[PDB]
Structures are given as structure tokens and as C-alpha cells.
Write a sequence for this structure.
């Protein structure tokens, strides 16, 4: 998160910190959010050979009683996910067991908010702590320069005159507008100049319901 502020610990209890394991490289990291006690939503580009989810975290370097480290049994990447266009960049993760509900862990031109443990600058490392930033929902023409941007499938997010943005490491985090999840962090420019492109959740509701009933 670039240009955000540190959250009060555990004030976003649905936030999930994902460690993504692959066969041929070191761990990668994403965000995500708990939507059922045994399901996390995140970005499809966060798929890997295996994933571990940490719920209840604030400072992810400092283990505490609020932490629930949970195994992911199965990944459900959207079947239409396309690595060339980044269309349908959404994935459900089924947890091996249902998470415990605690104070710190629970399920989930207008201004929206997005949180994450991602980089706080183009050249800066991932944040130790959960950060959040407020971003402006833009008209789709603001994202025309992303040639594969599609207004039906995606939101255009972030005033180009501000430096505020989600960034690397924030993948999969929910964009909330009026306390309701509207988007999921997907992609943006490598130089972090806003706006960025978020998945439009509403488009994926039937598919999400589909997976949630089948598993
Ligand atoms: C497992 C995460 C892989 C990393 C690797 C990378 O940064 O290229 N990653 C990652 O962190 N993001 C999110 C991202 C990347 C960049 Br560059 C800019 C922005 C984002 C989100 C955003 O709002 N801007 C990715 C979006 C698409 C594909 C890979 C992505
Ligand atoms: C996070 O925790 C580590 C280890 O306790 C500590 O070194 C670091 O200062 C903490 N970061 C913040 C911002 O609290
Ligand atoms: Zn705590
Ligand atoms: Zn679709």
C-alpha cells in the first residue's frame, strides 16, 4: 500500500495474509479476505503449488495469540483467468478447517478503501504491518491506457493526481466502498502511477456462489 496509514491492529479482521509456494522459486505473498469460515477470496495471479493463510495478523513478523495459520486444501482459480489480459483475476481458497471466530478474525467519484501488507513504495519492501489507503473510484476512461481494461469486468481506482495506490504484495485485498466489498486488487503500472485496475466483484457473484455450494 502506497500513501496509506498503519491500521489499528485487528481493525480489519477479515484480512488474510497469503504465503504462496511454488516449485521453482522462493515464497511469494498476497492478500485476500475471509468470506466464509473456510473460504478466502483473492486474486487468481496468486495461485501456486500450495498456499498458507494467516488470519488475525497485524505485524506479520510478530507471532501472537490472534494468529490462525491455516492450510489451504484446494485452490479454485477462475476457469476463465487469462495471464495475457489478466481478465477474471479471481480465486477462491478452501481452508482445511473452518477458522475460529474471534475479535481479531471474522468474515466480511466515490471514495473506497483498500488494505494490505504490500510494498509501501516502488523500491520499498513489503510492509511488516497492515496498511490502508483511501482511493477514488474513477470513470472507466481513466484506465483506457490499460489496453485490456474492461469496464464490465473491472474497476478503475485511484486519482492520477495522488500517489496513493495498492501495489505489489497487495494482490487479492478487498476494495470496500461504504463498508461493502466492491473490488479486489489486481494490477497496475510498475511505476505505481494511479489509477490501478481492480476486479469488479459483482460480475463474479454467480461463480462465487457456485463454488461455495459445490464444496
Ligand atoms: C504473487 C504476486 C505476484 C506479483 C509479481 C509482480 O509484482 O509482478 N504481483 C503483484 O504483486 N501484483 C499486484 C500489482 C503489481 C503491480 Br507491478 C502493480 C500493482 C499491483 C496491484 C496494484 O494496484 N498495482 C501482480 C499483478 C499481476 C501479476 C503479478 C503480480
Ligand atoms: C514488527 O515486529 C518486529 C518484531 O517484533 C519489530 O522488529 C518491528 O519493529 C515491528 N514493526 C512495527 C511497525 O511494529
Ligand atoms: Zn494483536
Ligand atoms: Zn466472466
Amino acid at each position: 500500500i502506497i500513501g496509506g496509514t498503519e491500521c489499528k491492529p485487528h481493525s480489519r479482521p477479515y484480512m488474510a495474509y497469503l504465503e504462496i509456494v511454488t516449485s521453482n522459486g522462493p515464497s511469494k505473498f498476497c492478500g485476500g479476505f475471509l468470506i466464509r469460515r473456510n473460504f478466502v477470496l483473492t486474486a487468481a495471479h496468486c495461485a501456486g503449488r500450495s498456499i498458507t493463510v494467516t488470519l488475525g495478523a497485524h505485524n506479520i513478523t510478530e507471532e501472537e495469540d490472534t494468529w490462525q495459520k491455516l492450510e489451504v486444501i484446494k485452490q479454485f482459480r477462475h476457469p476463465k483467468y487469462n495471464t495475457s489480459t489478466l481478465h477474471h483475476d479471481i480465486m477462491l481458497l478452501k481452508l482445511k478447517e473452518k477458522a475460529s471466530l474471534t475479535l481479531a478474525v471474522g468474515t466480511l467519484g466515490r471514495m473506497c478503501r483498500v488494505a494490505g501488507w504490500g510494498r509501501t513504495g516502488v523500491l520499498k519492501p513489503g510492509s511488516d504491518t497492515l496498511q490502508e489507503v483511501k482511493l477514488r473510484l474513477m470513470d472507466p476512461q481513466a484506465c483506457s491506457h490499460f489496453r485490456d481494461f474492461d469496464h464490465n469486468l473491472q474497476l478503475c481506482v485511484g486519482n492520477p493526481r495522488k500517489t496513493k495506490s495498492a501495489f505489489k504484495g497487495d494482490s487479492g485485498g478487498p476494495l470496500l466502498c461504504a463498508g461493502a466489498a466492491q473490488g479486489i486488487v489486481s494490477y497496475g503500472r510498475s511505476d505505481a502511477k494511479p489509477p490501478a485496475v481492480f476486479t469488479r466483484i459483482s460480475h463474479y457473484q454467480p461463480w462465487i456462489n457456485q463454488i461455495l455450494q459445490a464444496n
